[PDB]
Point group: C3
Chain length 117, copies 3
């Protein structure tokens, strides 16, 4: 089957180093939890809240050996009033046979309050 994996993380500053570090760390954690290999990945979508401008989060994928052919595009998360600020989210679509209810979705930094289930 092919399924989606969700991740979320936050930076303390809209700085290219912290966006890339914190996105790469999110990506690593998902891959680790989900045993994901680059050729299992259909595509990835990364969103930033409307207050991060330094760099596109997807540049962090280029710091993962083997991931040069995984499709990615970024997007503006909608501007909700009360939304967790300075947040990056990933929806990674993967060829997998693990059941829906057993996929591991990662939530790091201040994002751990988004989905505490």
């Amino acid at each position: 089957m092919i399924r989606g994996i969700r991740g979320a993380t936050t930076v303390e500053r809209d700085t290219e180093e912290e966006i890339l570090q914190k996105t790469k760390q999110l990506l690593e954690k998902i891959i680790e939890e989900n045993h994901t290999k680059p050729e299992d990945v259909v595509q990835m979508l990364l969103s930033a809240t409307p207050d991060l401008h330094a760099v596109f989060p997807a540049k962090a994928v280029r710091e993962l050996s083997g991931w040069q052919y995984v499709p990615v595009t970024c997007m503006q998360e909608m501007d909700v009033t009360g939304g967790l600020k300075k947040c990056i989210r990933v929806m990674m679509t993967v060829q997998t046979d693990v059941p829906q209810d057993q996929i591991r979705h990662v939530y790091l930094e201040k994002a751990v309050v988004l989905r505490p289930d």
Copy 2:
């Protein structure tokens, strides 16, 4: 195959109870029209126009029993001139066999004009 099921609806005011009620009603209808099982849904995207700020349309998914582990995420619709105001659109990806031309895509409220 896996295929996507498009939907769109419009709220009449930007407030949580309103956004979530109209998003949940769109989803119940998509699930109804295509007889969708949560375990059949790869992922779902929900976009709102930049004039809606009260709540993520996504939170409405959790009102559909059985849908907790379905991966949903929102994004913003681009502001297009002569665009439908206060509109919420979904792209749901389900594993299915029903031909492309027979997928039942759903447009509700003023979004019937899309």
Copy 3:
């Protein structure tokens, strides 16, 4: 498997006649290069940088024969300091047996500079 194909192009002006023309061109080249049939497409997402408001690029899909039931939707590409301007991007999800490293992603117009290793 189902794999993602990627495209990007740029318009010179924010006019409907241009967003729809550059988006038709970009979709043709991807369909061509990858032999994509409309019934192999799972869905498509198109993003545009926040400086394009003339039209939704998904309307160009309608200009392609047989592409009438392919799901499309758009989103705002995040605004990045030094991002390529007036740019449209396509993430076309398709069912293909072609392998990852042979999928042809097609970058056109000023977008040639975004991923030059493809």
